[PDB]
Amino acid sequence: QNPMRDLKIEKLVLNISVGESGDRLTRASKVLEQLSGQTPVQSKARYTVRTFGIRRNEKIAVHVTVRGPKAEEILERGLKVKEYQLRDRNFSATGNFGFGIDEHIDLGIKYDPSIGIFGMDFYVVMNRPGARVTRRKRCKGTVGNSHKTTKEDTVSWFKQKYDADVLDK
Amino acid sequence: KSSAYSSRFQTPFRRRREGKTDYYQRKRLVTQHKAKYNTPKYRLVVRFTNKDIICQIISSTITGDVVLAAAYSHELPRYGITHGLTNWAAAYATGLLIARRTLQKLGLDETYKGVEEVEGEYELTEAVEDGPRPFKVFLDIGLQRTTTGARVFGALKGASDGGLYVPHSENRFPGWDFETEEIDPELLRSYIFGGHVSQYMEELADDDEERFSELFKGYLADDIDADSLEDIYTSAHEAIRADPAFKPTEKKFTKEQYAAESKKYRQTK
Amino acid sequence: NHTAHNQTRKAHRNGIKKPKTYKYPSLKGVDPKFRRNHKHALHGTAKALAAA
Amino acid sequence: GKSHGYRSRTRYMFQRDFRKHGAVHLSTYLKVYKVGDIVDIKANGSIQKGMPHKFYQGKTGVVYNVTKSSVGVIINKMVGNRYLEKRLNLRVEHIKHSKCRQEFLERVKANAAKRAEAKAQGVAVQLKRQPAQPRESRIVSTEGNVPQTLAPVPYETFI
RNA sequence: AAAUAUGUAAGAAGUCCUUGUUACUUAAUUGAACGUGGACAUUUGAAUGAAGAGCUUUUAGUGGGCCAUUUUUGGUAAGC
RNA sequence: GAGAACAGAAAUCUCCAGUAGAACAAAAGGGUAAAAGCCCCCUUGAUUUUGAUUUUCAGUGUGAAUACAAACCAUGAAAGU
RNA sequence: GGUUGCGGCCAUAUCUACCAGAAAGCACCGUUUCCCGUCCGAUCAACUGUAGUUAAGCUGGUAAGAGCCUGACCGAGUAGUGUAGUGGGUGACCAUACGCGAAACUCAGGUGCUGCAAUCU
């Protein structure tokens, strides 16, 4: 097309939400420090529940932001076990999407007897470049209307690159 | 959307809607002690664009703001700095420039010569005994954050070494650690010169020399050898003290030709 | 039981007079840093006009 | 029982005007204040370090002391059967200059420009104000505006 | 967003100019306050009135209130 | 509101809209959006000496504040607080 | 007239949906040695104006608009109101004479002015 209007990637978040703090939560951190190669970060508690074991201001779940090429190759390996096939309901109207997996060891990682059997949530967000004027401090401002990423953009880019075959229903 | 949402909507001030002016900080900057009745409260504005450094001294009135004296960093080729137009040492040179320009305009550049030699130390300007008191000018930095060792404090360093009194403490100057609670002159004389851009020049001379030809593409073609950047920053520093005055650049036109060109583009009502 | 009947007539019968300000108001609540220097300036002027 | 606080029954009096919220604009600080200016007291309930009491809202006082970010004003107040000079210190946000005196001052500098001019001219001229005088003997016209009659309306269809 | 009611001003203890003080303040021989010294000295600066202005001392009685237009508040209404 | 496995009226995570419709210990009112709200950092101006002023008021007391001066400090790059 | 820095007034300055911008400035962008900060050089940090275009930001036009502001032989001397009577009415309330006098609506116009400094083919 033209420079600085393409739908380049921006980051991918590796969410895991089990629901209790302890050895299983530090193993939830260990399965991402040996998947993303970065120092992970957890999540505090939000609101009331007596049926999920979650009460206010406790660490309960884990997620890692990742940028650069490593998010791209983690998506590219998450799609060769998921057939490079993602649904249409999975694709939002606001310019990003995500997808679930029900195991990490399907990805090619190597087993340890003290890991567990639990899946993961790969959410990903992307933008056209020039989208730091939303982020920055001095002289901010929302980007133009023609530059906004939408469902048609993020679907017809995914059909071209990384081979969507998206199930429109 | 609705019209009752727009009826009761309060717009903020214009230079906050744009996002440029910290109306909180400007409040504490322009209010003065009312026993000092109509004394202006000078400020040292420094603003960093992508490839240009601004340094101004401002008074304050109701009818806008008033610029006492100004200084940019795209005019340093008058004294001899070619490249590194947005550098830590370029901001130090701009701080040394605006100090001398304001003191030459005011008539204080001989009584307040600043520091001729520079050695990398934290000092303050002192009052001359039975003399004119030092020119008191307070900083401001925009919306841009403060952090230790930053590009912004090069202008403050240049101001305090050029000899106008700016209140400052050493806990952000580069080399001040949280553990030692002390500034490092070994780091300070290497950041007021090209002692870190040349230290990157040497570590790109033997890491991937195509990147050394990429970043420093206009350096080696202009024959910018790393071993004398200290001296090329030193050399124009004395010519700053020799001639700091703003002489106006010779224009190509006289504003009517600019008006006669741009009025066809301007797309009026 | 707090009726303000006739009270305006009583306060207006002998008039509600002005406090009748003067030249040189009292310097009780003024700024003390200003007050000391005003005392010294007055003492300087008091001899400087006497000696001419 | 009852209540007499420091801000009692000041609901509709201290609240900000419509669409005038936020930090106050910076022209209210650069306006200087000397010792002798006739100043209003209109409070704004944003800053509270120096809000006047509810009686001095709207009243007009005279500055007598000037200090750091605050000025002292003098107000005559009726209590009982005489006036009392309440002096009071106010932060500079609640003090707007009064243009009542400053309309008189430019007229003084104007009558100094006409009286001293005409007294050297040779005509001793008038300078006082005069109220709305009665009109003059005017011959009105009638050219296209014919005086057309009126007749008051009846009550039909009014119901 | 009214009407009645209220704050202030409508000059001489003022307007302006010249240039002294000072330990406060300004970067500064700047600014503040108070001054010296000359000019504005008549319409001394909106109307009406002044049967005089200001200031002090001391002390008697009182410290049980009702009525009416009007506004209104409890009560189910009052010569409540 | 748009979205992502178990995941749901609701576990975490991403983005759009968001004049305050939330929060500020408490009663009701007023105030606040690069804050007075939410996290983090350093703290003890909740200190010392006495005055002046405002509120109920006889312009008594008590409580409460408001603006200074003199020190001694904290914070901040700094103005100031 | 264009752009930038710092602004005064804080919607005639906003929201929307478009369209367009030569130079210059701004901006997006490149890189992670060092100061530097995060989970992540995304904000922040620093280096370099080099690898690249106005797609964004920004500015200016445009719209049967939403607002907002401004003026009314507009609403209407209407509503509410100060004042008087041995005026009416059993009352609610009224009509009078002397005065002050809106507002929402309705119509018509407008969609920033400007201070200081720098820069402009």
Residue numbers in the entry:
A (entry chain E): 6 to 174
B (entry chain P): 8 to 276
C (entry chain a): 6 to 57
D (entry chain T): 2 to 160
The authors write:
Following their assembly in the nucleus, pre-60S ribosomal subunits are exported to the cytoplasm where they are converted to translation-competent particles. Analysis by single-particle cryo-EM with extensive 3D classification yielded a series of structures (hereafter termed states I-VI) that likely reflect sequential snapshots of final cytoplasmic pre-60S maturation. Sequential maturation of the cytoplasmic pre-60S subunit couples dramatic conformational rearrangements of two long flexible helices (the L1 stalk and H38) to recruitment of the final ribosomal proteins (eL40 and uL16) and assembly factor displacement. In conclusion, we have used single-particle cryo-EM to demonstrate the conformational changes during cytoplasmic 60S subunit maturation that couple incorporation of the ribosomal proteins eL40 and uL16 to the release of Nmd3 in what is likely to be a universal mechanism in eukaryotes.
